[PDB]
RNA sequence: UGUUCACCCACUAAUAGGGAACGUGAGCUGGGUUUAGACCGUCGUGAGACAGGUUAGUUUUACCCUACUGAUGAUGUGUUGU
RNA sequence: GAAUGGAUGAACGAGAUUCCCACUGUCCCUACCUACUAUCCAGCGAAACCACAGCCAAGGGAACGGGCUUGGCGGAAUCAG
RNA sequence: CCUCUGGCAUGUUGGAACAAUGUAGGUAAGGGAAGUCGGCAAGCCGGAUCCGUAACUUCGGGAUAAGGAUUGGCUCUAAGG
RNA sequence: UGGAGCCGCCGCAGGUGCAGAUCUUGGUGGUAGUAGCAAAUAUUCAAACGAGAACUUUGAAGGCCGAAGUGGAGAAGGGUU
């Protein structure tokens, strides 16, 4: 529905950006009913909202 | 309330309005002559074919600007557009007038729509901001509209 | 109202 | 004050209300006075523009510094099959003008031509001339008509007898033939009448009308660009970098005091397809189409006397933005009006012809047919085949 | 690279606001400010330039 | 040459003369006149002046009507096409 | 025309001129291409200006008329310019 | 000029066209300032290395004066601690 | 139509009669569905929510800012944003 709040906590529980949260699509509702972090801290360790890779900038 | 032009049997004969609506009042007028004595089922598939474009609405009166189109050559006019606003809202009048016949009992597919109206309402205004510090009215011109439907086939 | 011209620019200028 | 610096005015008044043409089939304006004494023909032809080449001649005009030279020559293709007549109309002469008097349709008429009543034709039952051909199978009918021959025969002058094209022969993507007026001018009004009675459901080539190295008169509407500014339309100067409105402009339209801007004023608006009447466009050669008795005959269109290869006219990759040009065709000197595929009236001279350049005899030497679809440099397939070898696909 | 904020709402580098670096055990690296600079104290005699020994500046 | 005007070169068949609000700035340009800055000369006690010279100096608006250019259309012919 | 400074003068100048070399669409003489507009549509939506208005020729007239006189004439509603 | 960390949704809207005028970019045969008040505008020039550098001069400059040549990729060699 | 006061005659009294004042205050037109919503490259596909999605959110892709940042923090000013 609307998950800026659950981005934004999610990065700031995980100390990257929020170009790397990534939520899982599918478990939306999940997601939605997170509101608090420690909510949230839970949903990482199940792997719904998950921290992306960085973006590879190669020196070779 | 009283409307303009009260019908000749009102015994079978459904009504409607709608005050103080967020249309474009010039352009609502010409979807409304457009409309007017139809029967009803023709009608509300005329609205349709506007808001899809594949039918179209002279703008006779108003008419400073518009652009010609070939869907106005079968009114016998040259200017024409496609208003979907116009559309959108005159087909929540009718919808609402099928519903108050199908309430009074009237055969709801004999309805000719007998007379319709656009009014000027109040308008709104907010404000616009020009060249060297003046300050503009940049205004809504909404209106009022209604109708009557008479059964008619 | 509008600006229109300059305070130097004096629009129809016959000297 | 009067303009300091003399120069001609841009472009001609005689030509203008510079506007879309009506028609798009050019117009016969006038055909040639008939002189009651030579023999019927044709007047006219109307025919489609295919393309353009080169062509190659000895030329014979002496004094010149290019007599018994050989020079190079833009052509216009103009592939003209043959003309069915389906009607004929007579006119007479009034002090108010010229009205048309009576039209005998044919009894047969092809859906080419019936075609061109309808607008819509998918649309349609094609009931044209049905009631109409009925008249021609039963003794009131057969009487009736007749008795307008004969009323036509006594009372019109001019006889135009009604053709159209057989637009089924062309590449093109239209099947709705053209019809057209043709004036038939030769001897007195009975036997002109006659003549084109005979000549009803009947094809009429192009060899019979027009002979080779004849001037004729092109008549077309031109290639259209559109809404086109004063600097386009009417080549009016440019003004200089520096002008802060605009520079692709006339900068005076008028003096103050006629205080309206004249019919004289250069401004902008459309610029093309408008009708117009080219004149003395040299014939350099009537062109036979692909025809049967074994085998194909391609040879008899662009082979000379002096190449003798097998080459059609139709360039390598066929003509650009047409087709291959398989019926008869004429061969003009020149460019003429228009785009191409566009219908296009060719008609005899309004005009005595006697000039040494009008009456010079032309043997082409060489006909080039190498690829107009880029820098081609091959005349012939066979003759690439040759020069490249083998290639990859094969 | 991990850039840094000032740890005080003293925006301007001053005398005041002079700082250095310093990784924490948390592994970021962080500002922490820094005393002045003392100075040992010179003599009374006012001819020798130096600055005395034995003395914590 | 800001010039109109003028003169000279060159070509030409000829390099005739004029008008249109000394045609034509919501067409341009702004070189010149003709604000404010400044320089020189002459004049003025002076502030300042100078059809005396010099240099630097904001060129607005069209979507209204008409006109013109092109573009759809209009009344008539029963309708429609040719 | 002489510190109301005269005469000079390297270096410097978004200062004022003149010529030459190079370079160029400045021009002969214009053309084509691209983007954003203008264009048409949905939605939204101002202003200035406005005696009435809005086709001309000539006349006379406050001595250059849209209106008056005498002639020419006049055909809905509009679009882009 | 291109990228990661971090950050945005193209700056108060969209769609369909690709006319004239424009605004902003480009390119032009042959000529080369004939254009214009006036080379305005644009174009040439441009970095580095190696040569080479005039008048005049307050002897400092002028000076990147002007005018030339070279420049990529690859595989080696030599020289510097 | 409206729903609570008002007039004739004789006298007296006046802040006593509007077309104008680039009049004052308020309202409404034509202009006009017109000008316009064109500075800074850019969007696309899917799903979710939802009466309703070009614009919200999630995911995927393509782009830009390009550490003198369209990033992360403060000062003044704002005052609950
Ligand atoms: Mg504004
Ligand atoms: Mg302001
Ligand atoms: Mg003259
Ligand atoms: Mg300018
Ligand atoms: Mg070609
Ligand atoms: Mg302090
Ligand atoms: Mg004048
Ligand atoms: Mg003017
Ligand atoms: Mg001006
Ligand atoms: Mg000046
Ligand atoms: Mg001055
Ligand atoms: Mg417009
Ligand atoms: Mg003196
Ligand atoms: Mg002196
Ligand atoms: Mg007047
Ligand atoms: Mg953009
Ligand atoms: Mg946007
Ligand atoms: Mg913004
Ligand atoms: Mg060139
Ligand atoms: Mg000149
Ligand atoms: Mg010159
Ligand atoms: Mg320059
Ligand atoms: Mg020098
Ligand atoms: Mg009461
Ligand atoms: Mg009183
Ligand atoms: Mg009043
Ligand atoms: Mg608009
Ligand atoms: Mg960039
Ligand atoms: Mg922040
Ligand atoms: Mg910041
Ligand atoms: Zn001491």
Same mark, same amino acid.
């Given at each position: 529905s609307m998950l800026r709040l659950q981005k934004r906590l999610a990065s700031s529980v995980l100390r990257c950006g929020k170009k790397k949260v990534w939520l899982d699509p599918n478990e939306t509702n999940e997601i939605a009913n997170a509101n608090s972090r420690q909510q949230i801290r839970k949903l990482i360790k199940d792997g719904l909202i998950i921290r992306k890779p960085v973006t590879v900038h190669s020196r070779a | 309330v009283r409307y303009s032009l009260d019908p000749?049997?009102?015994?079978?004969s459904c009504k409607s309005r709608g005050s103080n609506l967020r249309v474009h009042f010039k352009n609502t007028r010409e979807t409304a002559q457009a409309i007017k004595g139809m029967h009803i089922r023709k009608a509300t598939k005329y609205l349709k074919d506007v808001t899809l474009k594949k039918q179209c609405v002279p703008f006779?009166?108003?008419?400073?600007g518009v652009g010609r189109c070939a869907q106005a050559k079968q009114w016998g006019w040259t200017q024409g557009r496609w208003p979907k606003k116009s559309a959108e809202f005159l087909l929540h009048m009718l919808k609402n007038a099928e519903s108050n016949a199908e309430l009074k009992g009237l055969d709801v597919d004999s309805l000719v729509i007998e007379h319709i109206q656009v009014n000027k309402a109040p308008k709104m205004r907010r404000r616009t901001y020009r060249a060297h510090g003046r300050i503009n009215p940049y205004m809504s011109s909404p209106c009022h509209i209604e109708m009557i439907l008479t059964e008619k086939e | 109202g509008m600006w229109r011209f300059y305070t130097e620019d004096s629009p129809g200028l016959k000297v | 004050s009067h303009r300091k610096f003399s120069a001609p005015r841009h472009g001609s008044l005689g030509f203008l209300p510079r506007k879309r043409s009506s028609r798009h089939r050019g117009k016969v304006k006038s055909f040639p006075k008939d002189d009651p004494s030579k023999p019927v023909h044709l007047t006219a032809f109307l025919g489609y523009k295919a393309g353009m080449t080169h062509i190659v001649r000895e030329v014979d005009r002496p004094g010149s510094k290019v007599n018994k030279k050989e020079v190079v020559e833009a052509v216009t293709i103009v592939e003209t099959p043959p003309m069915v007549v389906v009607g004929i109309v007579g006119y007479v002469e009034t002090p108010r003008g010229l009205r048309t008097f009576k039209t005998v349709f044919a009894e047969h008429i092809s859906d080419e031509c019936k075609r061109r009543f309808y607008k819509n034709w998918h649309k349609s039952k094609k009931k044209a001339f049905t009631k109409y051909?009925?008249? %021609?199978?039963?003794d009131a009918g057969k009487r009736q008509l007749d008795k307008d021959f004969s009323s036509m025969k006594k009372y019109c002058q001019v006889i135009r007898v009604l053709a159209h094209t057989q637009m089924r022969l062309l590449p093109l993507r239209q099947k709705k033939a053209h019809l057209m007026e043709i004036q038939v001018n030769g001897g007195t009004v009975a036997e002109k009448l006659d003549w084109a009675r005979e000549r009803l459901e009947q094809q009429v080539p192009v060899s019979q009308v027009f002979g080779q190295d004849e001037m004729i008169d092109v008549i077309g509407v031109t290639k259209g660009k559109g809404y086109k500014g004063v600097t386009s339309r009417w080549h009016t100067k440019k003004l200089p970098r520096?002008?802060?409105?605009?520079?692709?402009?006339?900068?005076?339209?008028?003096? %103050?005091?006629?205080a309206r801007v004249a019919f004289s004023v250069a401004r902008a608006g459309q610029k093309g397809y408008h009708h117009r009447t080219e004149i003395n466009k040299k014939i350099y050669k009537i062109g036979q189409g692909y025809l049967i008795k074994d085998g194909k005959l391609i040879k008899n269109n662009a082979s000379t006397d002096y190449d003798l290869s097998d080459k059609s006219i139709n360039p390598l990759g066929g003509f650009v933005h047409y087709g291959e040009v398989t019926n008869d065709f004429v061969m003009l000197k020149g460019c003429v009006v228009g785009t191409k595929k566009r219908v296009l009236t060719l008609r005899k001279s309004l005009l005595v012809q006697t000039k040494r350049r009008a009456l010079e005899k032309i043997d082409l030497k060489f006909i080039d047919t190498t690829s107009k679809f880029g820098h081609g440099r091959f005349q012939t397939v066979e003759e690439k085949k040759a020069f490249m070898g083998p290639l990859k696909k094969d | 690279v991990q850039r840094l904020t000032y740890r005080r709402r003293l925006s301007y580098n001053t005398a005041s606001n002079k700082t250095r670096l310093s990784r924490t055990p948390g592994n970021r690296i962080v500002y922490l400010y820094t005393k002045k600079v003392g100075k040992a104290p010179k003599s009374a005699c006012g001819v020798c330039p130096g600055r005395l020994r034995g003395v914590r500046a």
């Amino acid at each position: 529905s609307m998950l800026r709040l659950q981005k934004r906590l999610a990065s700031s529980v995980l100390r990257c950006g929020k170009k790397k949260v990534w939520l899982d699509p599918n478990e939306t509702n999940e997601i939605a009913n997170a509101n608090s972090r420690q909510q949230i801290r839970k949903l990482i360790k199940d792997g719904l909202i998950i921290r992306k890779p960085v973006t590879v900038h190669s020196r070779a | 309330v009283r409307y303009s032009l009260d019908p000749e049997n009102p015994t079978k004969s459904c009504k409607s309005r709608g005050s103080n609506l967020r249309v474009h009042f010039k352009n609502t007028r010409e979807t409304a002559q457009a409309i007017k004595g139809m029967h009803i089922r023709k009608a509300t598939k005329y609205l349709k074919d506007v808001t899809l474009k594949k039918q179209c609405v002279p703008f006779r009166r108003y008419n400073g600007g518009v652009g010609r189109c070939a869907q106005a050559k079968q009114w016998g006019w040259t200017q024409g557009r496609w208003p979907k606003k116009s559309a959108e809202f005159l087909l929540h009048m009718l919808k609402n007038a099928e519903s108050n016949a199908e309430l009074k009992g009237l055969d709801v597919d004999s309805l000719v729509i007998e007379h319709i109206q656009v009014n000027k309402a109040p308008k709104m205004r907010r404000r616009t901001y020009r060249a060297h510090g003046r300050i503009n009215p940049y205004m809504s011109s909404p209106c009022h509209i209604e109708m009557i439907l008479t059964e008619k086939e | 109202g509008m600006w229109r011209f300059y305070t130097e620019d004096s629009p129809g200028l016959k000297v | 004050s009067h303009r300091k610096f003399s120069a001609p005015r841009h472009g001609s008044l005689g030509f203008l209300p510079r506007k879309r043409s009506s028609r798009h089939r050019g117009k016969v304006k006038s055909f040639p006075k008939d002189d009651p004494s030579k023999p019927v023909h044709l007047t006219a032809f109307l025919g489609y523009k295919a393309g353009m080449t080169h062509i190659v001649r000895e030329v014979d005009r002496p004094g010149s510094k290019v007599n018994k030279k050989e020079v190079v020559e833009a052509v216009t293709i103009v592939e003209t099959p043959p003309m069915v007549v389906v009607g004929i109309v007579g006119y007479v002469e009034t002090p108010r003008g010229l009205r048309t008097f009576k039209t005998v349709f044919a009894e047969h008429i092809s859906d080419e031509c019936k075609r061109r009543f309808y607008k819509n034709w998918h649309k349609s039952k094609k009931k044209a001339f049905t009631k109409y051909c009925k008249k %021609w199978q039963d003794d009131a009918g057969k009487r009736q008509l007749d008795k307008d021959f004969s009323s036509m025969k006594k009372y019109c002058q001019v006889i135009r007898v009604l053709a159209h094209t057989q637009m089924r022969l062309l590449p093109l993507r239209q099947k709705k033939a053209h019809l057209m007026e043709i004036q038939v001018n030769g001897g007195t009004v009975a036997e002109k009448l006659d003549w084109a009675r005979e000549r009803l459901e009947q094809q009429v080539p192009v060899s019979q009308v027009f002979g080779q190295d004849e001037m004729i008169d092109v008549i077309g509407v031109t290639k259209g660009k559109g809404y086109k500014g004063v600097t386009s339309r009417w080549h009016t100067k440019k003004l200089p970098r520096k002008t802060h409105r605009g520079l692709r402009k006339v900068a005076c339209i008028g003096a %103050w005091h006629p205080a309206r801007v004249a019919f004289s004023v250069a401004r902008a608006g459309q610029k093309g397809y408008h009708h117009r009447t080219e004149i003395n466009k040299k014939i350099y050669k009537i062109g036979q189409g692909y025809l049967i008795k074994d085998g194909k005959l391609i040879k008899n269109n662009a082979s000379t006397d002096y190449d003798l290869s097998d080459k059609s006219i139709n360039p390598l990759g066929g003509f650009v933005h047409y087709g291959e040009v398989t019926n008869d065709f004429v061969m003009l000197k020149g460019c003429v009006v228009g785009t191409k595929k566009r219908v296009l009236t060719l008609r005899k001279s309004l005009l005595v012809q006697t000039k040494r350049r009008a009456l010079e005899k032309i043997d082409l030497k060489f006909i080039d047919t190498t690829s107009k679809f880029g820098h081609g440099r091959f005349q012939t397939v066979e003759e690439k085949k040759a020069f490249m070898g083998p290639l990859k696909k094969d | 690279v991990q850039r840094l904020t000032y740890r005080r709402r003293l925006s301007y580098n001053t005398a005041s606001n002079k700082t250095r670096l310093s990784r924490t055990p948390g592994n970021r690296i962080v500002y922490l400010y820094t005393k002045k600079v003392g100075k040992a104290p010179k003599s009374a005699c006012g001819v020798c330039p130096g600055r005395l020994r034995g003395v914590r500046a």
